[PDB]
Design a protein around this ligand. Structure first.
Ligand code: GTP
Ligand code: GDP
Ligand code: CA
Ligand code: MG
Ligand code: MG
Lengths: 428, 440
């Protein structure tokens, strides 16, 4: 299986989504025209995973852009790689979702969703062998969160044997738009637990902290946060995009990473951590990459890895380096810290190497972990949800769109089940 | 798209309308004839200022606004005055006989004669909108038209436009400029009647504004003109997010999400800074930290009450002009380790911030200094309930004797509308107390 269909929803979804296509396009040698101007053949070998060929010979991203507002999509279209997207893959309403999950999922989103599925079907039909879908969205707003999870439900109904994966941005009070973000996040998680196969948890708390503590940026913008996201995203999709042995498609990644169907929320990690523009001149040694990629301070989800156990780990090393030194360092980490890797999944750490480094670095490592420490992320959202929900505060925004309190109670309970299910395996 | 229609009701609504619209024209470079040279798209457009102005084929930019008074003399001043070419005659609606400081007359006797005509003129503005967001209603609490007609109009708009948002700018009465003994009655009757029909209401206490004018601007005896110029600055700060765009601009609707935790709890406290004379601004720049600090000084509030003695449920800062997030965050961090800011336990404590880059404008001949940066804080505090407690007390003193009640009964109202309106106010005061109690 080859083709992945990419969907980006809402302001956050479309902003990280645009950056993703920007970064991977440069790696595959594709320019704003859709014209290849690269040297290596490794660049084109698996280009069909993400790109359509339309005679030119031009490469068109298999990408559908979705919003309930036109704003951020006009931003994308007049942005750097804006011309590359298929204009018919732009699907927008006018009325917005007002950071309201109920509007995205039930009222405004319901009005727009069929048009999105027409574009999904049109893209799915040109595929030799569709692998499945990736979605970029946030959980804190209304469109990416409410409408994004509506879309996932409808995509699963029409394609139940395909893999569904998400890059899901979790909200934090540190970088926050509205007080209702915990409501929107809890309702979205409930969906994600049932209808995705694999979810990369991108924690805005973590991205903020990395920017503040490590990159010495005193006031991080979304741009700074998204630079970390696009690097992580390029990293986690390396094995899908380039010639390679393991985690080479979406189903094989799921089979190695997900021991129990509900526990499919991954903590990504990246090394070296770099800020935008400002370059680093000294390449990292393989021992340094390996130490940094496993460091809590390189994690994109604000969870302490020492507070849990790793179920499974995938590690991707990028650049020209010694594969023998990689195996040794990877083996050294596990042997040194063996109590943090569950002993009932043997050889639960898999490593891949790709020759092509990302732009502006000679060496990089990407970490994908399924840790039971992710539970800290869900506990945090749960705490914020309950603080409001016990006084039913802000609920009228949701009941006004037809929702009952019961739906909140159920979504909370399911998220608490997920928490305690993680705790079960951290002690087994 | 996102159009907003303004409705200015009665003397106070209308005169505040004049001030706001004059100021909007200066903010966007629109001339008194409606021409705006900088607007290259003739007869239409989807720019930010189009939320408030429509455009004719001849290049005229026209307020999306209706002015309504039951008497003709305040609206005749708009008709013959500086900005008379701005408005199509059909946007300015007058009767002949006013409500004589009586809510019953504004709501029933006189107002029922003109209500169908007003809703027809509103309908004509709405029909020109491609994506109508909602209404901004300007009125006094104390006047007969401002209270009775506004409450009638709000009820009817709920019928004709469903749940389309309605925001109020409501002039709360003060003894220094008030014109009727019965203003406490009119205030309680309108507040009870419109409470279910309104999404958000900005109360402007005429005494807070009178004090600020006397104290900060050194005006011995402020007139309506003084008060209105300052009110328009505050209204402008609130609507600036709708009328301009920019990277760090944050839409009013998004502040509203944070500001209204329960439908009845919908009365934000506005505080504005800096209010300073030309004489004192000279050579003295107010920094971001200075203006943000001034937001937590109670003498700068639009309603007299003390937030230090209640609890916060939300805090929003709307900056305009030369302001960057770095400085905002530094100023906020200082204030947090130095001020009396206690939140209820059920809401998070982070301040929500928007910045518009376009700096404040002042009107020629006015009293305020042209500054490089300004701020409007909108907070949701339990302290706003003090303003209700004061009006309710005044209402109770007169109502226990039925003083002036015959004027309302003579117009067809029953005593049961009074006790009912009063009970709703008692329940509102109670609601404000309950939201400030800690959780179990
Ligand atoms: N801030 C401000 N307040 C005003 C102005 N005009 C009147 N008021 C206040 O509004 C109240 C009186 O109501 P008006 O708005 O004059 O009355 P109306 O709505 O015209 O009602 P009637 O004349 O009774 O039909 C008093 O509290 C006044 O001080 C004004 O231009 N500015
Ligand atoms: N990391 C990141 N988070 C964002 C970005 N834009 C918005 N957010 C976050 O996304 C959430 C709001 O959702 P947003 O995508 O704006 O709303 P939507 O358009 O209705 O889906 C909040 O948690 C914001 O902190 C972005 O560009 N990057
Ligand atoms: Ca125009
Ligand atoms: Mg947003
Ligand atoms: Mg009058």
């Amino acid at each position: 299986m080859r083709e992945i269909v990419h969907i980006q929803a809402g302001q956050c979804g479309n902003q990280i989504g645009a950056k993703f296509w920007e970064v991977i396009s440069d790696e595959h040698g594709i320019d704003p025209t859709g014209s290849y101007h690269g040297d290596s053949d490794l660049q084109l070998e698996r280009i069909n995973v993400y790109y359509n060929e339309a005679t030119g010979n031009k490469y068109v991203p298999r990408a559908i852009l979705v919003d309930l507002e036109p704003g951020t999509m006009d931003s994308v279209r007049s942005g750097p790689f804006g011309q590359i997207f298929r204009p018919d893959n732009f699907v927008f309403g006018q009325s917005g979702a007002g950071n309201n999950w109920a509007k995205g999922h039930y009222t405004e989103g319901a009005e727009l969703v069929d048009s999105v599925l027409d574009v999904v079907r049109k893209e799915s039909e040109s595929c030799d062998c569709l692998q499945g879908f990736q979605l970029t969205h946030s959980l804190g707003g209304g469109t990416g969160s409410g409408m994004g999870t509506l879309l996932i439900s409808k995509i699963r109904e029409e394609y139940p044997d395909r893999i569904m994966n998400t890059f899901s941005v979790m909200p934090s009070p540190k970088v926050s738009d509205t007080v209702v973000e915990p409501y929107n996040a809890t309702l979205s998680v409930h969906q994600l637990v049932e209808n995705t196969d694999e979810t990369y948890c991108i924690d805005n708390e973590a991205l903020y902290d990395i920017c503040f503590r490590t990159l010495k940026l005193t006031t991080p913008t979304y741009g700074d946060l998204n630079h970390l996201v696009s690097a992580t995203m390029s990293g986690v999709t390396t094995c899908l995009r380039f010639p390679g042995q393991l985690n080479a498609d979406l189903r094989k990644l799921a089979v190695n990473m997900v021991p129990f169907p509900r526990l499919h929320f991954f903590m990504p990690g990246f090394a070296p951590l770099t800020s935008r523009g400002s370059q680093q001149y000294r390449a990292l040694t393989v021992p340094e990459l390996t130490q940094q990629m496993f460091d809590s301070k390189n994690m994109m989800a604000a969870c302490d890895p020492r507070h849990g156990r790793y179920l499974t780990v995938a590690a991707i090393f990028r650049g020209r380096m010694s594969m023998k030194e990689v195996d040794e360092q990877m083996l050294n980490v596990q042997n040194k810290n063996s109590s943090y890797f569950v002993e009932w999944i043997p050889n639960n750490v898999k490593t891949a190497v790709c020759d092509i480094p990302p732009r502006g670095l000679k060496m990089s490592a990407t970490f994908i972990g399924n840790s039971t420490a992710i539970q800290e992320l869900f506990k945090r959202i749960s705490e914020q949800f309950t603080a409001m929900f016990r006084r039913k505060a802000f609920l009228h925004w949701y009941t006004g769109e037809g929702m009952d309190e019961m739906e909140f109670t159920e979504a909370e309970s399911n998220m608490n089940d997920l928490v305690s299910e993680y705790q079960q395996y951290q002690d087994a | 798209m996102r159009e907003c229609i303004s409705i200015h009701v009665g003397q106070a609504g209308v005169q505040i309308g004049n001030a706001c619209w004059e100021l909007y024209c200066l903010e966007h470079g629109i001339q008194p004839d409606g021409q705006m040279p900088s607007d290259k798209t003739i007869g239409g457009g989807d720019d930010s200022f189009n939320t408030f102005f429509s455009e004719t084929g001849a290049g005229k930019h026209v307020p999306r606004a209706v002015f309504v008074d039951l008497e003709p003399t305040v609206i005749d001043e708009v008709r013959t005055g500086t900005y008379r070419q701005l408005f199509h005659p059909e946007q300015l609606i007058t009767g002949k006989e006013d409500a004589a400081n009586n809510y019953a007359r504004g709501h029933y006797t006189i107002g029922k004669e003109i209500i169908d005509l007003v809703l027809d003129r509103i309908r004509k503005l709405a029909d020109q909108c491609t994506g109508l967001q909602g209404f901004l209603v300007f009125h006094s609490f104390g006047g007969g038209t401002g209270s009775g007609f506004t409450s009638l109009l709000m009820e009817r708009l709920s019928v004709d436009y469903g749940k389309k948002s309605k925001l109020e700018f409501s002039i709360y009465p003060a003894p220094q400029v008030s014109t009727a003994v019965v203003e406490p009655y009119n205030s309680i009757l309108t507040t009870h009647t419109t409470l279910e029909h309104s999404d958000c209401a900005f109360m402007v206490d005429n005494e807070a504004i009178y004090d600020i004018c006397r104290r900060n601007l050194d005006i011995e005896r402020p007139t309506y003109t003084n008060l209105n110029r300052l009110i328009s600055q505050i209204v402008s700060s609130i609507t600036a997010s709708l009328r301009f765009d920019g990277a760090l601009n944050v839409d009013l609707t998004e502040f509203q999400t944070n500001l209204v935790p329960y439908p009845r709890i919908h009365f934000p406290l506005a505080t504005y800074a800096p209010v300073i004379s030309a004489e004192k601004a000279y050579h003295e720049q107010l920094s971001v930290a200075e203006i943000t600090n001034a937001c937590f000084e109670p003498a700068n509030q639009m309603v007299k009450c003390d937030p230090r003695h209640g609890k916060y449920m939300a805090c929003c800062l709307l900056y305009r002009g030369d302001v960057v997030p770095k400085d905002v965050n530094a100023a906020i961090a200082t204030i947090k380790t130095k001020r009396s800011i206690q939140f209820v336990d059920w809401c998070p404590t982070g301040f929500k911030v928007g910045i518009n880059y376009q700096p404040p404008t002042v009107v020629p001949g006015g009293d305020l200094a042209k500054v490089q940066r300004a701020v409007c804080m909108l907070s949701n505090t339990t302290a706003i309930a003090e303003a209700w407690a004061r009006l309710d007390h005044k209402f109770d003193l007169m109502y226990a004797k039925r003083a002036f009640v015959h004027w309302y009964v003579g117009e067809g109202m029953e005593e049961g509308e009074f006790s009912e309106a009063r009970e709703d106010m008692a329940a509102l005061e109670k609601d404000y107390e309950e939201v400030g109690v800690d959780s179990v």
